Amino acid sequence: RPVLRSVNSREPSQVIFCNRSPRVVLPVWLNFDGEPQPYPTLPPGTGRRIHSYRGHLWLFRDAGTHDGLLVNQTELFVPSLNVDGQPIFANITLPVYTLKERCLQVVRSLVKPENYRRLDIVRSLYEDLEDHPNVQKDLERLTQERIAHQ
């Protein structure tokens, strides 16, 4: 959607992606049409200089599972103009997952999807296991929260 999208400012902004999580991080750039584009991943505890632009939008996920992550305590990161040539830091961290979500992550990392139904757990959880994290669904959710909050 045009709501969540990068603006073609053409105004360079120096940024540093800092992975302060124990996950391999996938930076995702929202292009000019609001479509998510992947960028090189970051290993845990590593940082990297990025040449981005004022008004561009970024979000971050676990590279292998797409589990949600936060950047500077929030969902989206928007580069601003550099002051005194100081790069803008994008500190990526794990959010406090609910205990239920964390257990689902672990079970998913150990079980093949075609085997979920073989687990001796309550019926309702089968659906939860199958409803894995999805960036597209997140963008739609964020857009509703975005609009529907004014």
Binding site: L110, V111, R118, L119
Partner: protein, 106 residues
């Protein structure tokens, strides 16, 4: 500089936090409020080492780097008797069943 702990005796365990700078005596005060036994009737341990009343938790070896919220450090607890010696005893938790085949690296 908070340390997160599990104070255990027999089949009872108390989850609580304290400052690396607080003392063992102050930890006993916390226990007294919960289990109703004064500091002079309590024996606190880090493994098999009896912790002295006047030392800080830090001086005793507890550090926030190891005693974390999600993996608290264990503090053993024993109570005094007037003519007998109790002996530190921490009852083990239960054990889980075998990891289901579908969850094994197959």
């Amino acid at each position: 500089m908070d340390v997160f702990l599990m104070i255990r005796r027999h089949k009872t365990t108390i989850f609580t936090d304290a400052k690396e700078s607080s003392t063992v005596f102050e930890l006993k005060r916390i226990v007294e409020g919960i289990l109703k036994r004064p500091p002079d009737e309590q024996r606190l341990y880090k493994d098999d080492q009896l912790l002295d009343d006047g030392k800080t938790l830090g001086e005793c070896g507890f550090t926030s780097q190891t005693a974390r919220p999600q993996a608290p450090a264990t503090v053993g607890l024993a109570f005094r008797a007037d003519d007998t010696f109790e002996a530190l005893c921490i009852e083990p938790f239960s054990s889980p069943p075998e990891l289901p085949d579908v969850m094994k690296p197959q």
